[PDB]
Amino acid sequence: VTNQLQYLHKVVMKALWKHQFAWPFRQPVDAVKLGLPDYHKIIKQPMDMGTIKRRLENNYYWAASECMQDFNTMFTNCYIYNKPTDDIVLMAQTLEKIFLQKVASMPQ
Amino acid sequence: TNQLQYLHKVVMKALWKHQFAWPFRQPVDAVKLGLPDYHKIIKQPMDMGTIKRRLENNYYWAASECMQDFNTMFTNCYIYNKPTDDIVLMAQTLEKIFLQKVASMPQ
Ligand SMILES: CCCn1cnc2c1c(=O)[nH]c(=O)n2C
Ligand SMILES: CCCn1cnc2c1c(=O)[nH]c(=O)n2C
């Protein structure tokens, strides 16, 4: 438990989990359910908000930046895999701007 | 602000001389790099040289305002290039440096 992991839990993760564009990221990418067969060929390190929150809630992270990186690989997985015109990409951009805003006022 | 100076003098410093930074020091010239559809795909181009001229003319109004530019830069790269391209790895390496350097930004 660090002041940054605490800020990532109660400020960042609280803002992003309840957001109206959060629902595609609240759980891992189910490639058979979403009809995306190539996904785990293109995206070798999947990541999603449900995993990040359990880890914050479970003391999994040690230095916050590791949690910041899990957020970042989540967003980039979406930009890398999906078409540029896909609504999902715009939803990833909107959640990300918020993440960046909130980390901009983070301590230590 | 001090945040804009930290982003100019610690954050932009550490990414600019990186060995993977050269594709991002100056705007994408679509015709030289062999990417003609670039501007159909990328509606808001961005590059560290633009963020740099803006950092030293006090263009930015907040730290986040400038961190957004950095983010658009990395995101154009992921969106435009094929997942297998070496520039995708370069952006991720540069981007992870930015996030750790931003984490320890004052206030
Ligand atoms: C709204 C599109 C369905 N969907 C849900 N989750 C997704 C996707 C997708 O097409 N691409 C993705 O990357 N993820 C995480
Ligand atoms: C290293 C590949 C050529 N190249 C140089 N700069 C680039 C690219 C590219 O393929 N895609 C880009 O986005 N930029 C900025």
* Three state DSSP letters for B45-81: CCCHHHHHHHHCCCCCCCHHHHHHHHHHHHHHHHHHC
* Method used to determine the 3D structure: X-ray
How many domains are contained in chain A? 1
3-state secondary structure of B23: helix
Tell me which residue of A13, A103, A96, A101 sits closest to B79, measured CA to CA. Answer: A96
**Quick check: B79 and A89 CB within 8 A?**
yes
- Ligand 2 in contact with B3 (CB < 6 A)? no
Which residue do the tokens 């003609």 mark?
A: B36
Give yes or no for B104 touching A (CB within 8 A).
Answer: yes
B101 is an annotated ligand-binding site residue: no
Tell me the C-alpha distance between B17 and B40, whole Å.
30
CA dist B69 and A65 (Å) reads 20
* Residue A15 to residue A1: CA distance in whole angstroms: 19
Minimal Cβ distance to A96: which of B71, B92, B102: B71
CATH code of the domain in which A44 resides? 1.20.920.10
Cα–Cα distance, B106 to B91 (Å, whole number): 25
Q: Which residues of A touch B107 (CB under 8 A)?
A: 105, 107
Rounded-to-integer distance, Cα A79 and Cα B36, Å: 20
Q: Which of A41, A49, A61, A44 is nearest to A21 (CA)?
A: A49
Q: B41 to chain A: which residues are within 8 Å by CB? A: 84
Distance from CA of B38 to the nearest CA of A (A): 11
Between CA A46 and CA A72 the distance in angstroms is 11
- Please name the residue that has the structure tokens 């970042």: A72
Would you say B37 is a known binding-site residue?
yes
Nearest-angstrom CA–CA distance, A64 and B61 = 26
> Which residues span the domain enclosing A24?
3-105
CA of A102 to the centre of ligand 2 (A): 30
**H helices of chain A, where?**
3-7, 13-17, 39-42, 49-57, 65-81, 87-104
Cβ count within 10 A of residue A34: 11
- Residue in A with minimal Cα distance to B82: A80
First-to-last C-alpha distance (Å) of chain B: 11
CA neighbor of A77 nearest in space, from B94, B68, B79: B79
CA of A80 to the centre of ligand 1 (A): 12
Neighbours of A82 (CB within 10 A): 18
CB contact under 8 A, A72 and B95: yes
Distance, CA of B4 to CA of B9 (rounded, Å):
9
Q: If you measure from the C-alpha of residue A39 to the centroid of ligand 1, how many angstroms do you get, rounded to a whole number?
A: 10
Residue B72: other Cβ atoms inside 10 A: 19
Rounded-to-integer distance, Cα A27 and Cα A18, Å: 13
